[PDB]
Design a protein around this ligand. Structure first.
Ligand SMILES: Cc1ncc(C[n+]2csc(CCOP(=O)(O)OP(=O)(O)O)c2C)c(N)n1
Ligand SMILES: Cc1ncc(C[n+]2csc(CCOP(=O)(O)OP(=O)(O)O)c2C)c(N)n1
Ligand SMILES: [Ca+2]
Ligand SMILES: [Ca+2]
Lengths: 676, 676
């Protein structure tokens, strides 16, 4: 019956009432975690009226099904979310969707719900904060000193992605990361004894985390606050706080799987209210004393931000160049004319693999754009992702790098790399971050990649060894389905550049992006510089490489197959067939061009054949016939594999000639046309 | 200079010479692991002339890049792989591909190369062995008593999938699993100090594994053998053997990342040979004393198998029913007329969600087909994957199940579930095993799913909550790209049944499969029983549901959209448009039908519109126009989401009418036609 106790009851009952109104959602974890949420938010620095303050503490709800809890906190603190929004929990079009979405929910830093992601996002927010602080802080100028608080449950701890990120976070000594495990011994299938009997705490010690255990987290907010204070004293380890809770605390059904994921019974809600001093006839109650208490904390936080703004002004006076850089980044702007650093090629230049062209781009743009950081999942000398002369992001205590470093050694951890990249993007400050692996193993990170798209984060995958062109490693390494998968996902730019100019256009798009993740599919093998390519034309996503006003056929291709199409054009000329060539380095960018531009590239009245050594899925958007690879690859020298599958100038020409013959006497309209 | 030492040198030099001949591949781990490989194979029971002996010990090379080591062992032991095959390492069409493939390589139990998979496959082989032994062994009849030996490296230990499987294997007390960590402190990016500093051994203890450490695994084969003996005494824990090795042992470049993944220099190979007593001018040497020693072990193993065959004959006399069941399973045959247990429905029956129809199928077929086992990734009460009256697969010591159980509690571990299923299939004995999750989270397991397809394993995903039809959980849970991804992968049957009869056909296909993995996309929401459906017709993958000889349009649909198409047909009739309906429950099965059958379903001369509330990718194989969902979903009541996106009878009818109008005056041929 203190104000703190009343606040905790208010949180619990708002969450339960939201689930009740929707007749859908998850009351168990909100009931169990309300004390911890109250305690953590009271320690956090944040401004509900400025969700982007760069020195705010960040909170991540990794157990995203518990979002009625998050929404209740945001409402109580006066974010741009109200009780009326809570009444619309899980209703079409509301600001309170069934799992939190950063695009829709003020105060949701990331999109969670798919288990394991949020803790990894928290690792990335903390990684970014450490890099940012190392870049900008000066004596008497703690520009960045914020913490990252993460709630997670048993499901997050079972998902392998969280193990990857936790191993890495311990290695990186990320002392401003404080995670809280909802140790409630229940998941959907019942007791954790049925599937999850590991010693979690011993595992986290093995990663180099600090541990604090709170044995009565249903009530002991003093101990939760003390655990935070303890964690802040351990500056060289991330901390895991074990919150031993009862799922559904207070419910008649507390401590059971039934309270995880379905609305409580009406009589249960009544007894909750009466036990805690609330009116069982009232829903969505917000006692004004709770509002007052929370408003006091907001007002204090706003005074902290006000002082930070003055610190920043003084920083700009003392450190004019760093201050201007920081201001530009907080405004969301890249350096003026940064793109003049992009390499440009001519057809007289030598053939180069697009992985090597990518290395060259990075080596030119990293010195010009400080907000670029990135790494590789143990493939640095293969993906070619590190610029010479940069230092790795490591704790200085290791001697292996510094937090001011710009290159991240992710280890063999693609999925966590993907989710950490999302967290780096979520930090803000214009970070443009990237992660390298082989294209076929981007698939290990599909859970996170999809969330990059849904969350609208401008992350970049440097995805080398894109096809059978990699050769001898064979079919376990050779993508077939991978581009189709990601192209079929909304809001993913999938660049497959053919040459030096196209590779620079791909990076221009990836770095300028503010709302769209990028995958750059890059070759092991050398490709020629194309006659007709440029950054300008490739920036349109698709363009006419070879214009033929009397074309019998247009060949549309990507990447390594554009040069193949150009060679096929010459074979076809000897057969009396005139071809044009279209290069389609990014289907999403192309799709976003005007209808008239797109029709200038893929006109009516001419058959169009696509060529790409991967799945034919998607290609009918742009072509009448498709020459692709819809079977697994082979282990051998790459030129021999191309010959086996007839991806040769003669093989393409044969299929082009068959396409011309198939449409003889038919009326052909652009693949871009549709009935609706 | 003992025969054992000569054998180890022979293995090392065969592997190095294979890499040298290919001028491609990985010599480092083979050099470091040859002592351990020698020691392990000397302890293993196997018949090179009968790779399918059901009581063999299994070996898995999880660090599949080290396959020159595996191939050398198989050659030396007289599997159907020769020195001439080793000379063709990594060459197109050879039996020695750059990573091991179970379909191509005699003695390769699984396909490895993508890191982390093999250890999880080993967990599944061991899980299957325990279940099999619990089912069949009797006093004096140890029908199954075999071990599972796995080699893995640092990369496997960094991949989250291995953490998932190792947590689960420890929980399951899988004492016949013995894994060996190649602790060589090197990965591609250099020292493990840069990214992988966790206390691996402490982590494995936290999972409940037993540990043996071999501090000089470059030479101490006595200690490696003793570690195996020790592991066999610990019957209630899987064991991790830490093999401290030097990568590239013996090379001038030993202990460096450069020896991981590129051929050795010719002068290095010369000094290796002279140091070990071999002729530096000779490649692919096989000393006859090594062959003799290995042949002695093979002969002993063959006598063990001979005795096992007599044990099996005596078992059939004493336990005639179990013996006949075991024989049938070893012959690869399902029970005669098992499919008479499949439920059959009529259009007079009530509407049912396909997840519930799936539960009903499983409840009928599990009692009839003992080789069906399966589980869920913490979604048992949502996926509806457990048959009432079955017991969980657990060690009896827990009180929670028994190894004779048939239902696996995977926990929140989709990726490991996928790779464990591959291992269960790889065990053999006709296991037909399944794993449940929400369709959108099958994507977490993409690495393993792709390997199910490449490995030709008949595993089944019970993938419920397939679309926006799930409603309130919202876009983080609602598949868009997922079916396109898996349909674009070679050799995946992706069933999306519309009703009770189609769900039974999907299971008939999944259980009869011997070479093709299945994904069953199942609904949360109720669907009507269709007029015109049957197991017989749905077994063709695609069929004419509503035949209209004067059709103006055919609507092709799957799953929940078939009923929508039927309702749209009625709207269209009021607009003067006659439609037919095709149901396409599995595109792969359909594609495999005769050309004439397929054309009877998708004829020339009529526009075809597809309807499926997911990506339109792939659908142009079967339709002229596509009505799909190419954006993320929404959080709300499912009927309201369908209305928002116009997946209504009127919305489908409008697009069908526009399709008819678009093709007025045009000649239309089947989407099945192509130019080549
Ligand atoms: C990757 C992924 N797999 C499966 C699910 C389905 N799901 C949601 S919550 C949940 C389990 C909840 O377990 P826990 O994290 O312990 O939550 P608590 O029940 O204690 O609230 C599951 C399996 C999911 N959301 N994400
Ligand atoms: C999922 C996946 N990601 C990345 C790779 C690329 N790759 C192959 S071997 C290897 C690293 C080798 O490290 P380790 O397992 O320690 O092998 P060792 O160098 O000691 O032989 C990597 C990253 C892969 N094969 N699979
Ligand atoms: Ca829990
Ligand atoms: Ca290693």
């Amino acid at each position: 019956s203190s104000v703190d106790q009343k606040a905790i009851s208010t949180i619990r009952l708002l969450a339960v009432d939201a689930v009740a109104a929707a007749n859908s959602g998850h009351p168990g974890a909100p009931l169990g975690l309300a004390p911890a949420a109250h305690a953590v938010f009271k320690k956090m620095r944040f401004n509900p009226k400025d969700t982007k303050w760069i020195n705010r503490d960040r909170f991540v709800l990794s157990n995203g099904h518990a979002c009625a809890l998050l929404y209740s906190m945001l409402v109580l603190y006066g974010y741009d979310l109200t009780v009326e929004d809570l009444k619309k929990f899980r209703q079409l079009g509301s600001k309170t969707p069934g799992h939190p979405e950063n695009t829709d929910v003020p105060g949701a830093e990331v999109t969670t719900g798919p288990l394991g992601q949020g803790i990894c996002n928290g690792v990335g927010i903390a990684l970014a904060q450490a890099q940012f602080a190392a870049t900008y802080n000066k004596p008497d100028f703690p520009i960045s000193d914020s913490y990252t608080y993460v709630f997670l449950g048993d499901g997050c701890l079972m998902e392998g992605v969280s193990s990857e990120a936790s191993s890495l976070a311990g290695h990186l000594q990320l002392g401003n990361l404080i995670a809280f495990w909802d140790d409630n011994k229940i998941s959907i299938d019942g007791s954790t004894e049925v599937a999850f009997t590991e010693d979690v705490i011993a595992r986290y010690k093995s990663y180099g985390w600090h541990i604090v255990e709170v044995s009565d987290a249903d009530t002991d907010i003093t101990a939760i606050a003390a655990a935070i204070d303890e964690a802040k004293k351990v500056t060289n380890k991330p901390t895991l706080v074990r919150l031993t809770t009862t799922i559904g605390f207070g419910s008649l059904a507390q401590g059971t799987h039934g309270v995880h994921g379905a609305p409580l019974k009406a009589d249960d809600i009544k007894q909750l209210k009466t036990k805690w001093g609330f009116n069982p006839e009232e829903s969505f109650a917000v006692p004004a004393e709770v509002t007052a208490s929370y408003n006091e904390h907001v007002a204090e936080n706003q005074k902290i931000q006000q002082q930070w703004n003055e610190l920043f002004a003084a920083y700009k006076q003392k450190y004019p160049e760093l201050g201007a850089e920081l201001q530009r980044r907080l405004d969301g702007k890249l350096p003026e004319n940064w793109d003049k650093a992009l390499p440009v090629y001519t057809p007289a230049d030598a053939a180069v693999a697009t992985r090597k062209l990518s290395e060259i781009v990075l080596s030119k743009i990293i010195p010009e754009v400080p907000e670029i950081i990135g790494g590789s999942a143990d493939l640095t000398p293969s993906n070619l992702t590190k610029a010479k002369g940069t230092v790795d992001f490591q704790p200085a205590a290791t001697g292996l790098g510094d937090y001011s470093g710009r290159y991240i050694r992710y280890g063999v951890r693609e999925h966590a790399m993907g989710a950490i990249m999302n967290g780096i993007a979520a930090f803000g400050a214009n970070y443009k971050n990237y992660g390298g692996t082989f294209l076929n193993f981007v698939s290990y990170a599909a859970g996170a990649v999809r969330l990059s798209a849904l969350s609208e984060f401008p992350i970049t995958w440097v995805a080398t060894h894109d096809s059978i062109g990699l050769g001898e490693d064979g079919p376990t390494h050779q993508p077939i389905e991978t581009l189709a998968h990601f192209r079929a996902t909304p809001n993913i730019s999938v660049w497959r550049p053919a040459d030096g100019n196209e590779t620079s256009a791909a990076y221009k798009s990836a770095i300028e992006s503010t709302h769209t993740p990028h995958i750059l599919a890059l070759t092991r093998q050398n490709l020629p510089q194309l006659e007709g390519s440029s950054i300008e034309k490739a920036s349109k996503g698709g363009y006419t490489l070879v214009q033929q006003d009397k074309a019998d056929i247009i060949i549309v291709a990507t990447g390594s197959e554009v040069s193949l199409a150009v060679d096929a054009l010459k074979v076809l000329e000897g057969q009396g067939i005139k071809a044009g060539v279209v290069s389609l380095p990014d289907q999403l960018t192309f799709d976003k061009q005007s209808e008239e531009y797109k029709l200038s590239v893929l006109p009516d009245g001419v058959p169009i054949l696509s060529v790409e050594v991967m799945s034919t899925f998607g290609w009918s958007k742009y072509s009448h016939q498709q020459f692709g690879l819809n079977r697994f690859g082979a282990s051998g020298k790459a030129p021999e594999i191309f010959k086996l599958f007839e991806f040769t100038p003669e093989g393409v020409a044969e299929r082009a000639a068959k396409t011309v013959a198939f449409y003889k006497g038919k009326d052909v309209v652009s693949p871009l046309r549709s009935a609706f």
